[PDB]
């Protein structure tokens, strides 16, 4: 059961200073965390191999 | 059936409070005027609808009457002492009929007033019969008058509560209510009481209710108009009403209308109430759990440092057991005796059977205490003015060991020193003064013009005051002339202008020593003055001395049934300090320690006078004292005369009065509390006790510890050989060697042990706090004045004062809510008729309710019942009812009003100000902000109201010793800066300017605003009702952005079957919730709560918290250190003592309420008894990495940002009536640093 | 604790009211009965074998 809550708590729980402009926390967790079919990629990788 | 009985309007309201239908402003206004236009007596037509099946029946010998002919007698010259019958104390109102001495009022047929005739003789002639009927009728119209409005009206809401079940809200913890209006012995009793005041199928009430006094309606012959009923139906109502916001059970409802209708038939019904006051209290509060089988759970409140900064904390949960009950015997046997004299022994037996079911501390048996305890009569009790002068304030306290008149030394002058050799606790108290005031006498504190400044603002009361006489028929004895106004003068004799009359030479001169000729005016400035090192060195007997916490964690600590506890209450302390023994050894012993001083040292305006001294037979020579002692020969002669009163009650006619006794209506009765009983455990009950466990105890004993001293009541919580203590041998013993102790020196100390814990009345058992529902009654409230003050809008105020304090008390919301919206909507619809004009009106829509701080039942888009009543009042409030559903009407406005072409960037284009507008949202928000009480008229003899002499020459008082350089240095330094460079304020800030003008409008609020002014209060209300704004506020339109959602509830402070608060059980929905999420004991951490507000020495016609936010609202700005300054100058502060504040005042170490403070976000009055301390700094974030957005990032502004967010979360946490959850900002509408440039334009104003 | 604790005069003033009487020589005597009545049932039941 791939829950994302996973790898959220470990990327928000690194510190960062709020006085850069550019944040390198705020940028993947723009990445990857917009969810689309909770994740069902992998499967069909799986699925095609 | 109750329901299709009443009126169009109302039957559509009592749907719409009840959560039916969202109430529209239509519904609130033919709901409104329903009230007004019908005439009273008909809501008691709406009894006669619902069946009964209650057992109580009425007896016939109410409206019996012993007349008041006999009951009125004019013992004394002109003083209409009422002649007891059977006591010294039965003369609260007799019980008769006002039948013969009424003229039916032409407006209002067959309902009475003061006979014309009768009347005119008691002003000109009196007859002992013309003016004892004179006095009977403004009693009894005044006794009828203690009620916040009419009760009939108050019993009309009730109804309207009742008319429908409330709709279930979907919360599982709601409980659908058990009470039945057709199973009440209530308002079965007030029906059953009805029918007597009955011509032919309508209703008459005996009282209808004027602003006035009452209006009494006149019987057909044959019937009689017994003044006790109307204050038999005003318990039987707030009887009705507590027994529906309590869930009380109608068996035990039942004794307590018993209760009253015993009272109503014997001879007075004020007098019988009173003598069983502490009959219910007694029979459950002070009795429970003295049964076998004890034992749930209770707190474990430990108090870590206690000699000092009594900070509780709670620690853990006691598990109960048959050891350590209540070791104090049950009052069933004292109490039942004195309640079977009435004979009401029945009503006592059923109660106790209750009591005995209920025998282990659960949330159960803990709302049981609750509901005996609002049986006891909550109405006030008027008595004649002259009569209670007699009666209360002349009682000479008995001495059982005088000083021997050969114990003082020989006479310096006027006062006399104790001999070193007379021990005993005149000793003790005469060493304890003494010491104090040697050390008052050398201090630097009150050399400093500002010391003296705020000196003068103590004495000129800014709150309280009396109607003091004058000064110049007093300074007849006196040369000095008083001033008098240089144009037409409004204010009279006010505190303030008592000041002004006389402040040539510093508010006293040493020729104005006739300070000692009529004093202490009430039913004197230059006599506070003269009593300045009284309550100088009082204030340094009680260095170690709010209610929030340091009495609400107390009372908890001391009830838990580890520590037994004695709690003594001194009876009469304003009519036991004395100069035969109390009073002159207090003079005598500030005088023997202001010799320390230098002895040539002028004090307070006062010189340095020479004295006899002839206190060496052998070498009598004049001395040369202190100005300190100067004052101590001036109290001590005016300490020995006594105080003068010339009481003249407006309630009696002609009753005009000189009377002298030895009260005083002023810390020091507080002061001698711990002196004296530092004496007792350590000296006298040590010395006999004739037990050697109770000496034991003692030994180990202070008074630092184990003893918390306030006015007059007192805890006394013993040593840790606690509950193993034998109450034969120890405590029994204990307590007749403490009244002996007091009784020895006039002290009737009155102690009432039990394992309870009173303390200046907030009870609490077993480390559960039970609130007193008869305290503060719902329709109960005082006036003490024949004719009331009510305008229109000081209505409002008292619902919003009636909503409020019923919260603190843990009352059930549901039934309650509803009866305050209710209430709340009756006060929307007022008028104003003109003497020689038209009438006028009002209508406050409802959202001017909400913003005061009444929560709102059902909004047009959720379900009923789900806003708290914990919701801050404002924009706090506001934020947090508009933050629930913005995702409501963006919606729903999207698919009803066209868009708006441009952006309003908190909604979208979807238009929602027209549609709140449509609501009437922002009529009541612009209602509430418009002024309620009449400005007092703009008249004055000259120039235009400039040149004002009684308000410029109050400053005269407040200048002295050229302090006046540096308020003129203030707004001088302050004008050049801010005008010109930058912070441009435009109004002032708090200075020493604004306090001269504060006083006058605290003093020209005379009554009767003229009908010049309260017409142009209600035009202007009406103005911005028809055209608000639709623009919000300037800081509410800010707040919106803020998009606050909230997450779980908070890991739990309370093991939540402990019970803490008086029935916050599970019936309760919120009041379990949050008074279990977060904590009882509000001691949190010291970056958050702790005390601070860093001036503290304020001048007190300034606020404190005003100071405090423009001290903080300039660091927020980029301030020059220029500006804390020039405005630490405007107070009046040194410019030394200025700059370690202008210095201080970082956002770095300042507390986090402060910084709320600066933008009007405070921590409300609602949930001050709680534990909100950690809640806002662990949890509710301002910024949560992962669930928030990066727009939100307040970044380098966070140290002064991040409170005002977390406030934001909070504000919407309390507002939902569920779990306190973690609320967490979101998002906010712009990024945080576009919100934080946004409030720094705000904050410029 | 306590500012100028004397910890052996603390317990001596806190253990006081537990050594009062026969709180400790209750069980005493309800072990003597529990062994008389002990033996009492072992021999009844293995005399009736």
Same mark, same amino acid.
């Not at chain 2, 040590?686 to 006015?711: E, F, W």
């Not at chain 2, 409300?1164 to 909100?1172: C, D, G």
């Not at chain 3, 005493?28 to 529990?34: D, K, L, P």
């Given at each position: 059961?791939?829950?994302?809550?996973?790898?959220?708590?470990?990327?928000?729980?690194?510190?960062?200073?709020?006085?850069?402009?550019?944040?390198?926390?705020?940028?993947?967790?723009?990445?990857?965390?917009?969810?689309?079919?909770?994740?069902?990629?992998?499967?069909?990788?799986?699925?095609?191999? | 059936?109750?329901?299709?009985?009443?009126?169009?309007?109302?039957?559509?309201?009592?749907?719409?409070?009840?959560?039916?239908?969202?109430?529209?402003?239509?519904?609130?206004?033919?709901?409104?005027?329903?009230?007004?236009?019908?005439?009273?007596?008909?809501?008691?037509?709406?009894?006669?609808?619902?069946?009964?099946?209650?057992?109580?029946?009425?007896?016939?010998?109410?409206?019996?009457?012993?007349?008041?002919?006999?009951?009125?007698?004019?013992?004394?010259?002109?003083?209409?002492?009422?002649?007891?019958?059977?006591?010294?104390?039965?003369?609260?109102?007799?019980?008769?009929?006002?039948?013969?001495?009424?003229?039916?009022?032409?407006?209002?047929?067959?309902?009475?007033?003061?006979?014309?005739?009768?009347?005119?003789?008691?002003?000109?002639?009196?007859?002992?019969?013309?003016?004892?009927?004179?006095?009977?009728?403004?009693?009894?119209?005044?006794?009828?008058?203690?009620?916040?409005?009419?009760?009939?009206?108050?019993?009309?809401?009730?109804?309207?509560?009742?008319?429908?079940?409330?709709?279930?809200?979907?919360?599982?913890?709601?409980?659908?209510?058990?009470?039945?209006?057709?199973?009440?012995?209530?308002?079965?009793?007030?029906?059953?009481?009805?029918?007597?005041?009955?011509?032919?199928?309508?209703?008459?009430?005996?009282?209808?209710?004027?602003?006035?006094?009452?209006?009494?309606?006149?019987?057909?012959?044959?019937?009689?108009?017994?003044?006790?009923?109307?204050?038999?139906?005003?318990? $039987?109502? +707030?009887?009705?009403? &507590?027994?529906?916001?309590?869930? /009380? #059970?109608?068996?035990? =409802?039942?004794?307590? !209308?018993?209760?009253?209708?015993?009272?109503?038939?014997?001879?007075?019904?004020?007098?019988?109430?009173?003598?069983?006051?502490?009959?219910?209290?007694?029979?459950?509060?002070?009795?429970?759990?003295?049964?076998?089988?004890?034992?749930?759970?209770?707190?474990?409140?430990?108090?870590?440092?206690?000699?000092?900064?009594?900070?509780?904390?709670?620690?853990?949960?006691?598990?109960?057991?048959?050891?350590?009950?209540?070791?104090?015997?049950?009052?069933?046997?004292?109490?039942?005796?004195?309640?079977?004299?009435?004979?009401?022994?029945?009503?006592?037996?059923?109660?106790?059977?209750?009591?005995?079911?209920?025998?282990?501390?659960?949330?159960?048996?803990?709302?049981?205490?609750?509901?005996?305890?609002? $049986?006891? +009569?909550?109405?006030? &009790?008027?008595?004649?003015?002259? /009569? #209670?002068?007699?009666? =209360?304030?002349?009682? !000479?306290?008995?001495?059982?060991?005088?000083?021997?008149?050969?114990?003082?030394?020989?006479?310096?002058?006027?006062?006399?020193?104790?001999?070193?050799?007379?021990?005993?606790?005149?000793?003790?108290?005469?060493?304890?003064?003494?010491?104090?005031?040697?050390?008052?006498?050398?201090?630097?504190?009150?050399?400093?013009?500002?010391?003296?400044?705020?000196?003068?603002?103590?004495?000129?009361?800014?709150?309280?005051?009396?109607?003091?006489?004058?000064?110049?028929?007093?300074?007849?004895?006196?040369?000095?002339?008083?001033?008098?106004?240089?144009?037409?003068?409004?204010?009279?004799?006010?505190?303030?202008?008592?000041?002004?009359?006389?402040?040539?030479?510093?508010?006293?001169?040493?020729?104005?020593?006739?300070?000692?000729?009529?004093?202490?005016?009430?039913?004197?400035?230059?006599?506070?003055?003269?009593?300045?090192?009284?309550?100088?060195?009082?204030?340094?007997?009680?260095?170690?001395?709010?209610?929030?916490?340091?009495?609400?964690?107390?009372?908890?600590?001391?009830?838990?049934?580890?520590?037994?506890?004695?709690?003594?209450?001194?009876?009469?302390?304003?009519?036991?300090?004395?100069?035969?023994?109390?009073?002159?050894?207090?003079?005598?012993?500030?005088?023997?320690?202001?010799?320390?001083?230098?002895?040539?040292?002028?004090?307070?305006?006062?010189?340095?006078?020479?004295?006899?001294?002839?206190?060496?037979?052998?070498?009598?020579?004049?001395?040369?004292?202190?100005?300190?002692?100067?004052?101590?020969?001036?109290?001590?002669?005016?300490?020995?005369?006594?105080?003068?009163?010339?009481?003249?009650?407006?309630?009696?006619?002609?009753?005009?009065?000189?009377?002298?006794?030895?009260?005083?209506?002023?810390?020091?009765?507080?002061?001698?509390?711990?002196?004296?009983?530092?004496?007792?455990?350590?000296?006298?009950?040590?010395?006999?006790?004739?037990?050697?466990?109770?000496?034991?105890?003692?030994?180990?004993?202070?008074?630092?510890?184990?003893?918390?001293?306030?006015?007059?009541?007192?805890?006394?919580?013993?040593?840790?050989?606690?509950?193993?203590?034998?109450?034969?041998?120890?405590?029994?013993?204990?307590?007749?060697?403490?009244?002996?102790?007091?009784?020895?020196?006039?002290?009737?100390?009155?102690?009432?042990?039990?394992?309870?814990?009173?303390?200046?009345?907030?009870?609490?058992?077993?480390?559960?706090?039970?609130?007193?529902?008869?305290?503060?009654?719902?329709?109960?409230?005082?006036?003490?004045?024949?004719?009331?003050?009510?305008?229109?809008?000081?209505?409002?105020?008292?619902?919003?004062?009636?909503?409020?304090?019923?919260?603190?008390?843990?009352?059930?919301?549901?039934?309650?809510?509803?009866?305050?919206?209710?209430?709340?909507?009756?006060?929307?619809?007022?008028?104003?008729?003109?003497?020689?004009?038209?009438?006028?009106?009002?209508?406050?829509?409802?959202?001017?309710?909400?913003?005061?701080?009444?929560?709102?039942?059902?909004?047009?888009?959720?379900?009923?019942?789900?806003?708290?009543?914990?919701?801050?009042?404002?924009?706090?409030?506001?934020?947090?009812?508009?933050?629930?559903?913005?995702?409501?009407?963006?919606?729903?406005?999207?698919?009803?009003?066209?868009?708006?072409?441009?952006?309003?960037?908190?909604?979208?284009?979807?238009?929602?100000?027209?549609?709140?507008?449509?609501?009437?949202?922002?009529?009541?928000?612009?209602?509430?902000?418009?002024?309620?009480?009449?400005?007092?008229?703009?008249?004055?003899?000259?120039?235009?109201?400039?040149?004002?002499?009684?308000?410029?020459?109050?400053?005269?008082?407040?200048?002295?010793?050229?302090?006046?350089?540096?308020?003129?240095?203030?707004?001088?330094?302050?004008?050049?800066?801010?005008?010109?460079?930058?912070?441009?304020?435009?109004?002032?800030?708090?200075?020493?300017?604004?306090?001269?003008?504060?006083?006058?409008?605290?003093?020209?609020?005379?009554?009767?605003?003229?009908?010049?002014?309260?017409?142009?209060?209600?035009?202007?209300?009406?103005?911005?009702?028809?055209?608000?704004?639709?623009?919000?506020?300037?800081?509410?339109?800010?707040?919106?952005?803020?998009?606050?959602?909230?997450?779980?509830?908070?890991?739990?402070?309370?093991?939540?079957?402990?019970?803490?608060?008086?029935?916050?059980?599970?019936?309760?929905?919120?009041?379990?919730?949050?008074?279990?999420?977060?904590?009882?004991?509000?001691?949190?951490?010291?970056?958050?709560?702790?005390?601070?507000?860093?001036?503290?020495?304020?001048?007190?016609?300034?606020?404190?918290?005003?100071?405090?936010?423009?001290?903080?609202?300039?660091?927020?700005?980029?301030?020059?250190?220029?500006?804390?300054?020039?405005?630490?100058?405007?107070?009046?502060?040194?410019?030394?003592?200025?700059?370690?504040?202008?210095?201080?005042?970082?956002?770095?170490?300042?507390?986090?309420?402060?910084?709320?403070?600066?933008?009007?976000?405070?921590?409300?009055?609602?949930?001050?008894?709680?534990?909100?301390?950690?809640?806002?700094?662990?949890?509710?974030?301002?910024?949560?990495?992962?669930?928030?957005?990066?727009?939100?990032?307040?970044?380098?502004?966070?140290?002064?940002?991040?409170?005002?967010?977390?406030?934001?979360?909070?504000?919407?946490?309390?507002?939902?009536?569920?779990?306190?959850?973690?609320?967490?900002?979101?998002?906010?509408?712009?990024?945080?640093?576009?919100?934080?440039?946004?409030?720094?334009?705000?904050?410029?104003? | 604790?306590?500012?100028?604790?004397?910890?052996?005069?603390?317990?001596?003033?806190?253990?006081?009211?537990?050594?009062?009487?026969?709180?400790?020589?209750?069980?005493?005597?309800?072990?003597?009965?529990?062994?008389?009545?002990?033996?009492?049932?072992?021999?009844?039941?293995?005399?009736?074998?």
């Amino acid at each position: 059961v791939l829950d994302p809550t996973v790898l959220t708590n470990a990327i928000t729980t690194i510190s960062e200073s709020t006085t850069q402009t550019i944040s390198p926390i705020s940028e993947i967790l723009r990445l990857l965390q917009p969810m689309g079919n909770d994740y069902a990629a992998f499967w069909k990788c799986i699925a095609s191999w | 059936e109750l329901f299709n009985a009443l009126p169009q309007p109302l039957q559509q309201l009592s749907l719409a409070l009840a959560g039916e239908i969202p109430l529209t402003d239509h519904i609130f206004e033919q709901a409104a005027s329903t009230w007004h236009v019908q005439p009273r007596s008909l809501t008691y037509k709406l009894l006669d609808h619902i069946p009964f099946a209650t057992p109580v029946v009425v007896p016939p010998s109410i409206y019996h009457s012993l007349d008041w002919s006999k009951c009125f007698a004019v013992n004394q010259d002109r003083v209409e002492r009422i002649p007891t019958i059977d006591n010294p104390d039965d003369v609260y109102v007799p019980n008769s009929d006002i039948g013969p001495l009424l003229t039916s009022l032409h407006t209002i047929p067959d309902y009475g007033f003061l006979h014309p005739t009768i009347e005119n003789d008691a002003t000109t002639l009196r007859a002992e019969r013309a003016r004892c009927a004179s006095t009977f009728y403004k009693i009894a119209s005044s006794q009828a008058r203690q009620v916040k409005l009419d009760p009939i009206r108050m019993l009309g809401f009730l109804l309207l509560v009742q008319a429908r079940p409330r709709v279930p809200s979907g919360l599982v913890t709601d409980q659908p209510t058990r009470r039945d209006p057709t199973l009440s012995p209530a308002l079965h009793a007030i029906w059953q009481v009805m029918q007597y005041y009955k011509v032919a199928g309508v209703y008459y009430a005996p009282a209808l209710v004027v602003p006035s006094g009452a209006i009494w309606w006149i019987p057909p012959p044959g019937k009689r108009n017994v003044v006790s009923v109307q204050y038999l139906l005003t318990d $039987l109502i +707030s009887l009705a009403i &507590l027994a529906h916001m309590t869930d /009380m #059970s109608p068996t035990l =409802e039942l004794t307590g !209308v018993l209760m009253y209708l015993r009272a109503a038939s014997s001879h007075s019904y004020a007098y019988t109430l009173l003598q069983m006051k502490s009959v219910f209290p007694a029979l459950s509060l002070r009795s429970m759990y003295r049964n076998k089988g004890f034992g749930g759970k209770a707190p474990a409140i430990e108090w870590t440092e206690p000699r000092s900064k009594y900070k509780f904390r709670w620690t853990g949960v006691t598990q109960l057991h048959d050891g350590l009950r209540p070791r104090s015997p049950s009052m069933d046997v004292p109490t039942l005796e004195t309640l079977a004299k009435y004979e009401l022994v029945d009503i006592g037996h059923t109660i106790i059977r209750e009591r005995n079911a209920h025998p282990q501390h659960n949330h159960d048996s803990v709302r049981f205490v609750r509901d005996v305890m609002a $049986l006891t +009569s909550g109405m006030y &009790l008027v008595r004649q003015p002259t /009569m #209670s002068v007699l009666r =209360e304030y002349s009682q !000479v306290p008995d001495i059982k060991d005088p000083i021997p008149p050969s114990a003082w030394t020989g006479p310096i002058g006027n006062v006399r020193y104790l001999l070193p050799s007379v021990q005993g606790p005149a000793r003790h108290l005469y060493d304890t003064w003494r010491a104090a005031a040697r050390q008052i006498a050398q201090d630097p504190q009150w050399h400093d013009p500002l010391n003296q400044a705020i000196m003068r603002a103590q004495y000129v009361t800014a709150r309280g005051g009396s109607s003091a006489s004058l000064k110049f028929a007093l300074k007849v004895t006196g040369i000095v002339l008083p001033e008098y106004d240089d144009s037409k003068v409004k204010k009279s004799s006010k505190i303030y202008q008592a000041a002004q009359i006389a402040r040539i030479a510093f508010m006293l001169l040493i020729a104005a020593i006739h300070a000692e000729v009529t004093m202490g005016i009430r039913n004197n400035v230059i006599q506070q003055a003269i009593s300045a090192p009284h309550t100088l060195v009082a204030n340094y007997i009680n260095k170690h001395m709010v209610v929030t916490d340091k009495v609400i964690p107390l009372i908890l600590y001391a009830s838990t049934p580890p520590n037994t506890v004695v709690n003594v209450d001194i009876k009469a302390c304003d009519a036991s300090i004395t100069y035969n023994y109390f009073l002159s050894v207090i003079c005598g012993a500030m005088h023997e320690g202001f010799e320390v001083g230098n002895a040539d040292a002028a004090f307070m305006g006062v010189p340095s006078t020479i004295v006899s001294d002839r206190r060496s037979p052998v070498a009598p020579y004049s001395r040369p004292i202190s100005g300190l002692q100067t004052m101590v020969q001036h109290l001590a002669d005016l300490y020995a005369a006594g105080f003068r009163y010339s009481v003249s009650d407006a309630f009696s006619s002609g009753n005009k009065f000189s009377f002298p006794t030895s009260t005083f209506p002023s810390t020091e009765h507080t002061a001698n509390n711990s002196t004296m009983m530092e004496y007792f455990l350590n000296v006298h009950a040590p010395s006999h006790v004739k037990s050697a466990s109770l000496k034991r105890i003692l030994t180990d004993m202070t008074i630092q510890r184990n003893y918390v001293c306030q006015g007059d009541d007192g805890i006394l919580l013993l040593p840790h050989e606690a509950a193993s203590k034998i109450s034969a041998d120890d405590m029994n013993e204990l307590l007749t060697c403490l009244r002996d102790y007091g009784q020895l020196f006039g002290w009737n100390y009155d102690i009432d042990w039990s394992d309870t814990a009173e303390y200046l009345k907030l009870y609490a058992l077993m480390g559960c706090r039970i609130p007193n529902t008869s305290r503060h009654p719902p329709v109960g409230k005082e006036y003490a004045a024949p004719q009331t003050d009510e305008i229109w809008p000081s209505l409002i105020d008292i619902v919003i004062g009636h909503h409020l304090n019923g919260v603190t008390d843990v009352l059930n919301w549901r039934e309650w809510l509803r009866f305050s919206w209710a209430f709340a909507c009756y006060s929307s619809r007022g008028g104003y008729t003109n003497p020689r004009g038209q009438s006028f009106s009002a209508q406050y829509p409802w959202w001017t309710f909400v913003y005061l701080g009444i929560p709102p039942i059902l909004l047009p888009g959720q379900t009923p019942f789900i806003h708290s009543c914990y919701m801050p009042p404002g924009d706090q409030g506001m934020f947090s009812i508009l933050n629930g559903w913005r995702d409501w009407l963006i919606s729903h406005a999207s698919t009803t009003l066209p868009p708006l072409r441009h952006n309003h960037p908190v909604w979208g284009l979807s238009d929602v100000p027209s549609l709140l507008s449509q609501f009437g949202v922002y009529a009541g928000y612009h209602a509430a902000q418009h002024y309620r009480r009449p400005k007092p008229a703009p008249e004055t003899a000259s120039s235009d109201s400039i040149n004002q002499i009684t308000s410029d020459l109050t400053e005269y008082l407040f200048y002295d010793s050229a302090l006046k350089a540096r308020v003129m240095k203030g707004r001088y330094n302050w004008e050049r800066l801010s005008s010109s460079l930058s912070l441009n304020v435009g109004s002032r800030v708090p200075s020493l300017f604004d306090v001269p003008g504060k006083w006058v409008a605290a003093g020209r609020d005379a009554e009767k605003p003229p009908p010049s002014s309260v017409e142009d209060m209600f035009t202007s209300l009406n103005r911005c009702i028809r055209r608000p704004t639709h623009s919000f506020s300037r800081l509410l339109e800010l707040y919106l952005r803020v998009h606050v959602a909230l997450g779980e509830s908070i890991p739990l402070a309370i093991d939540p079957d402990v019970p803490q608060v008086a029935g916050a059980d599970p019936a309760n929905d919120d009041h379990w919730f949050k008074y279990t999420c977060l904590g009882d004991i509000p001691s949190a951490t010291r970056n958050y709560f702790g005390e601070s507000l860093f001036v503290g020495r304020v001048v007190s016609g300034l606020d404190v918290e005003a100071v405090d936010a423009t001290l903080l609202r300039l660091k927020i700005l980029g301030a020059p250190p220029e500006a804390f300054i020039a405005v630490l100058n405007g107070i009046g502060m040194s410019d030394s003592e200025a700059h370690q504040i202008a210095g201080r005042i970082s956002l770095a170490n300042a507390q986090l309420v402060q910084i709320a403070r600066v933008v009007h976000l405070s921590i409300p009055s609602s949930w001050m008894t709680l534990n909100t301390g950690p809640y806002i700094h662990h949890h509710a974030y301002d910024f949560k990495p992962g669930i928030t957005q990066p727009s939100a990032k307040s970044r380098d502004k966070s140290i002064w940002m991040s409170p005002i967010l977390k406030l934001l979360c909070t504000s919407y946490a309390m507002t939902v009536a569920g779990p306190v959850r973690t609320s967490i900002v979101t998002e906010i509408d712009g990024s945080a640093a576009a919100l934080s440039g946004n409030l720094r334009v705000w904050m410029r104003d | 604790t306590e500012t100028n604790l004397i910890p052996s005069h603390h317990y001596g003033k806190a253990f006081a009211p537990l050594f009062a009487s026969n709180a400790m020589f209750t069980r005493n005597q309800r072990a003597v009965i529990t062994r008389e009545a002990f033996v009492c049932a072992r021999s009844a039941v293995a005399q009736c074998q």
